[PDB]
Amino acid sequence: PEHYIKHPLQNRWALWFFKNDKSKTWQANLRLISKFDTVEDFWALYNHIQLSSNLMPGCDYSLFKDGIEPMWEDEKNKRGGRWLITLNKQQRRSDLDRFWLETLLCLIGESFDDYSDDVCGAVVNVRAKGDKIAIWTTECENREAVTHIGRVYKERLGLPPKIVIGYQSHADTATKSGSTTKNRFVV
């Protein structure tokens, strides 16, 4: 049995790609790459595609549970938010790919116990002005869930205690009267 069965995942996942081509629609630009629901199918996809560090600036990968669009206004994201990891240009080289793989593994591996159900997806943004990785969750007001996810994710990335990462609500980000978005939680 272990000699021939694929190892199912708790959830079915969809990998998306976005190219920020300003001369086309954000509908023609967003793109389902593929869906998978086993560990082996995850690896076959990951091995076939570019590392984030090799994408052109302005591109995203997004891994979301099947049925959740990688867009904050989706029913399952609209009341939620994201644990944001910001990276500088030198971390593109040292940390981006390793942090993104670890993020994928936390999602597909259900690494947040009961609270993995609050996870919607994850996004990596490749940008000239700084790369970003984030885990999106369903409800900002689920304080225990959001906090546990943040604590485990920080530990999995190996970030030291002196580094603070913030959780920002999507609605706050969309409607901020200023430059920076305020946090709902930090870890």
């Binding site: 995942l9 708790q10 560990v39 082996e40 091995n47 593994l105 591996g109 259900e110 690494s111 999995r156």
Partner: peptide, 14 residues
């Protein structure tokens, strides 16, 4: 229950 895979296992399937 729930299907949980730790990091070591998920790496051994690659």
């Amino acid at each position: 229950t729930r299907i949980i895979y730790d990091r070591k296992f998920l790496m051994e399937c690659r």
